RNA sequence: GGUGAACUAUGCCUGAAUAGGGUGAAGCCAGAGGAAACUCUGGUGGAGGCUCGUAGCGGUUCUGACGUGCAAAUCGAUCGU
RNA sequence: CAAAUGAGAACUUUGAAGACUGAAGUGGGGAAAGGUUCCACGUCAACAGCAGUUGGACGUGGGUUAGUCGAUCCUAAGAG
RNA sequence: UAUGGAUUCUUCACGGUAACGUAACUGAAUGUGGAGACGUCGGCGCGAGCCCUGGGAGGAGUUAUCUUUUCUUCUUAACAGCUUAUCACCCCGGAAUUGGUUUAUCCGGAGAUGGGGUCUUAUGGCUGGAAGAGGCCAGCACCUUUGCUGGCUCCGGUGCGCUUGUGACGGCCCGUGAAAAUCCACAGGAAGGAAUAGUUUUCAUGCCAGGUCGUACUGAUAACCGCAGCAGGUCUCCAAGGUGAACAGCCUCUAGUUGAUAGAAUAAUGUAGAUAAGGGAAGUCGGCAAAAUAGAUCCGUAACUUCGGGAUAAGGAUUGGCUCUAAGGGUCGGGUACGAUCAACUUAGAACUGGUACGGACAAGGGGAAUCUGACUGUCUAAUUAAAACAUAGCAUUGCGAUGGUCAGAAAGUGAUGUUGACGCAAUG
């Protein structure tokens, strides 16, 4: 909704920042098994439902 | 090329619909470089982009 | 009531180009301008004067620049001079025939 | 936004000490179809308002533009 | 021992929406007939949980389509209002 | 239909046609809801039940400016 | 927070007969009033925008032939001043031969008509804003930042038009259609002030500041919910031309799309549309499905009836085009009975005409005679039953006079009816 609240916009911002793929450099760390971001979100696939 | 942005911009700049905006099929490169409202204004002033005339709806039979 | 509206047409450019006959164009004007609804009933109401290069139509009855442009367009379409000459008003009632 | 009718109210408005700009607009209009006169609008810009004095006489406009002190910033346009 | 009235049921509070026609209620104006009482006629007017019928709301029939569907209830015509 | 783009075009872009929605629209805005889907650039592995050079996809970014619009204030059914 | 203006040796203003007017023109406690603040429908009036339309100033289209032609631009915001109003109100005067007057019938000795005024500013007009903007044209200088230079942007008309707003009214109800914050005003007359000065910041001008949060986009045959880019569902504003009664259907303008896996062929059976000689329900549980009817005008219309209906009953006829005819209106006066200009669409006739066709597509009732049943309008089994079921008005019965009836609560210094009182509440048929 266009007329949001500040809490809703803060949640928007947090989810926006979290929605990003794995940095190319962390994949090269020693003893590192994390290959990709397993918590990725699309606005169509999964709703934040807040 | 892909001049969807340019067609939308030309409609917005010159005040008619995308159905009336005419883009020159021989200046595709120039229109492609034009990526601002100022450049689209340059184009419409240069005649590269031309407002199509309004489709006629005569009232003669009605009159 | 007897206000004389004067519409001047500059034919200098087509005359110099050599593809226009101002005398014939003016003659077409007198013999095709219709007054009250019928042609030739210009009972000394409108006159066309030719100086060779600028044709002037003076009028006391109902006459308009839109009428004059319509007549000129009809003549250039009859003579197949369209797509070559434009009828453009430089000033109010100061029309001309442009070539380039 | 406020229109001034009298020269005396115009000249007591000029010396109000809150005026910084005075714009003069030259207009062409029609008194008779054969006599298009010139109109002058002196737009004095106060803090709250824009006053516009109107003059249809070229001579009166000239005398007003002369009597206006040169200290005020006059934009002629 | 807890969670639900975002569907739906029912109140309440505050908002919004609903072409064009048919009929012609009370009230009012004039006229005719008549001894009278009164009776009659023509207008006007614009009532109704009135009526034909869009939007809307619903869902009669085809027991039509579909029926491993568009859809765990939809689609089309025909319908109720 | 043609041209351009491209390794590749039924599907992209441009032009020319032919159409449709037909102002209780397939138009222009909004409410709830969504949450960045908006816009540009690059790009086609997967997705768009054919294709794809296109995309609401993928990657990187940019973008939402108020004394006057709204909340904020008031009270309603009510909650407490 | 200061200056001007206003107000004083009659300290807190004048004018108007009055309605009331003005630039101001003290005003505490206390009290009161108003605005906020209100339903719906109908017709009428006014305005805005849109539609339509004439001349003129530009641009575009057609031009075998015709058309002064077809399409398009000619715009004015918030805000300031002046002015403009139906309704109301004042003054004079005193009315039946009652008069005024609305589309609608109400008003007048509680003072009508008439004459003269006052007011509200919805609304409109002029000016300022503001042509300097916007738009339409023409031209100039060109890997040029890109601009600049000339013109124009004018004047009308109409309406049962559409939509919206407004006003004065009328109808409806056993229904009479929020509250509060806020703002103003009045009543009263506490306090204070005047002759070298004061009173207001409800007159004008002037100075300062205005924080926080939202704001992109979709809003749906792809941005929401249905497991999905699902034929489903989901609130609302704006709304051009023609036909037509019509935000019907059908065709167009502005705007928007051209998105639904495609190519070839045209077998059977399908799904959706149709047409059929003669018969005309013989089909079938049953006329299911389909057909027939259908708009408008005129004519005619039965039984029955709760007199309102039935009723569009039943049943007939007409309908095009073209050329005419007729009727229906608004704006000025003789020295204080004769005429002139224009929009505009309704209705009724007359010829003529044609492959007797004409609501020519679209759109668009089949009807009648009965029986059973429910009075009706309305409601329900979302997703197999819309019904004769439920509701209903009407009728009747029952309880209860408040320390009460009916019903809640584990209790309660607790509750619903109840902001109620037998013309009420409660419980039933």
From Swiss-Prot, chain A:
Keywords: Cytoplasm, Ribonucleoprotein, Ribosomal protein
Pfam families referenced in this protein's UniProt entry, alphabetically: Ribosomal_L39
Residue span of region Disordered: 1-21
GO biological process: cytoplasmic translation
GO molecular function: structural constituent of ribosome
Highest taxon in the source lineage: Eukaryota
Bias (Basic residues) ranges: 6-19
Xref: Gene3D superfamilies: Ribosomal protein L39e
InterPro entries: Ribosomal_eL39, Ribosomal_eL39_CS, Ribosomal_eL39_dom_sf
Compartmental location: Cytoplasm
Keyword Transmembrane helix among record annotations: no
Cellular-component GO terms for this entry: cytoplasm; cytosol; cytosolic large ribosomal subunit
Coiled-coil ranges per UniProt: none
Subunit structure: Component of the large ribosomal subunit (LSU). Mature yeast ribosomes consist of a small (40S) and a large (60S) subunit. The 40S small subunit contains 1 molecule of ribosomal RNA (18S rRNA) and 33 different proteins (encoded by 57 genes). The large 60S subunit contains 3 rRNA molecules (25S, 5.8S and 5S rRNA) and 46 different proteins (encoded by 81 genes). eL39 interacts with YIH1.
UniProt similarity note: Belongs to the eukaryotic ribosomal protein eL39 family.
HAMAP family in alphabetical order: Ribosomal_eL39
Name of the protein in its database record: Large ribosomal subunit protein eL39
Swiss-Prot record, chain B:
Highest taxon, organism lineage: Eukaryota
Glycyl lysine isopeptide (Lys-Gly) (interchain with G-Cter in ubiquitin) crosslink location in chain: 20, 52, 59
Phosphoserine: modified positions: 29, 36
Basic residues biased stretches: 58-63
Subcellular localization, as worded in the UniProt entry: Cytoplasm
Known role: Component of the ribosome, a large ribonucleoprotein complex responsible for the synthesis of proteins in the cell. The small ribosomal subunit (SSU) binds messenger RNAs (mRNAs) and translates the encoded message by selecting cognate aminoacyl-transfer RNA (tRNA) molecules. The large subunit (LSU) contains the ribosomal catalytic site termed the peptidyl transferase center (PTC), which catalyzes the formation of peptide bonds, thereby polymerizing the amino acids delivered by tRNAs into a polypeptide chain.
Assembly and interaction partners: Component of the large ribosomal subunit (LSU). Mature yeast ribosomes consist of a small (40S) and a large (60S) subunit. The 40S small subunit contains 1 molecule of ribosomal RNA (18S rRNA) and 33 different proteins (encoded by 57 genes). The large 60S subunit contains 3 rRNA molecules (25S, 5.8S and 5S rRNA) and 46 different proteins (encoded by 81 genes). eL19 lies in close proximity to the binding site for eukaryotic initiation factor eIF4G.
Family (UniProt): Belongs to the eukaryotic ribosomal protein eL19 family.
Miscellaneous section: Present with 97700 molecules/cell in log phase SD medium.
Protein's name according to its UniProt entry: Large ribosomal subunit protein eL19A
Source organism per UniProt: Saccharomyces cerevisiae (strain ATCC 204508 / S288c)
Entire protein: shown range: 2 to 64 of 189
Swiss-Prot record, chain C:
Any single biological process term in GO: cytoplasmic translation
Keyword match Ribosomal protein: yes
GO-annotated molecular function: RNA binding; structural constituent of ribosome
TM region positions: none
Principal place of residence: cytoplasm
Keywords: Cytoplasm, Ribonucleoprotein, Ribosomal protein
Compartments where located: Cytoplasm
Any one of the GO CC terms: cytosol
Misc remark: Present with 60400 molecules/cell in log phase SD medium.
The protein's role, per its UniProt record: Component of the ribosome, a large ribonucleoprotein complex responsible for the synthesis of proteins in the cell. The small ribosomal subunit (SSU) binds messenger RNAs (mRNAs) and translates the encoded message by selecting cognate aminoacyl-transfer RNA (tRNA) molecules. The large subunit (LSU) contains the ribosomal catalytic site termed the peptidyl transferase center (PTC), which catalyzes the formation of peptide bonds, thereby polymerizing the amino acids delivered by tRNAs into a polypeptide chain.
Subunit (UniProt): Component of the large ribosomal subunit (LSU). Mature yeast ribosomes consist of a small (40S) and a large (60S) subunit. The 40S small subunit contains 1 molecule of ribosomal RNA (18S rRNA) and 33 different proteins (encoded by 57 genes). The large 60S subunit contains 3 rRNA molecules (25S, 5.8S and 5S rRNA) and 46 different proteins (encoded by 81 genes).
Similarity section: Belongs to the eukaryotic ribosomal protein eL22 family.
Annotated protein name in UniProt: Large ribosomal subunit protein eL22A
Organism whose genome encodes this protein: Saccharomyces cerevisiae (strain ATCC 204508 / S288c) (Baker's yeast)
Gene: RPL22A
UniProtKB/Swiss-Prot annotation, chain D:
Family per record: Belongs to the eukaryotic ribosomal protein eL38 family.
Protein name (database record): Large ribosomal subunit protein eL38
UniProt keyword annotation of Ribonucleoprotein present: yes
Gene Ontology cellular-component terms listed: cytoplasm; cytosol; cytosolic large ribosomal subunit
Function: Component of the ribosome, a large ribonucleoprotein complex responsible for the synthesis of proteins in the cell. The small ribosomal subunit (SSU) binds messenger RNAs (mRNAs) and translates the encoded message by selecting cognate aminoacyl-transfer RNA (tRNA) molecules. The large subunit (LSU) contains the ribosomal catalytic site termed the peptidyl transferase center (PTC), which catalyzes the formation of peptide bonds, thereby polymerizing the amino acids delivered by tRNAs into a polypeptide chain.
Pfam families (UniProt xref): Ribosomal_L38e
GO molecular function, one term: structural constituent of ribosome
UniProt key word Cytoplasm: yes
InterPro entries from the UniProt entry: Ribosomal_eL38 (IPR002675), Ribosomal_eL38_sf (IPR038464)
GO process terms (BP): cytoplasmic translation; protein-RNA complex assembly
Extra information: Present with 50200 molecules/cell in log phase SD medium.
Protein keywords: Cytoplasm, Ribonucleoprotein, Ribosomal protein
Cell compartments where the protein resides: Cytoplasm
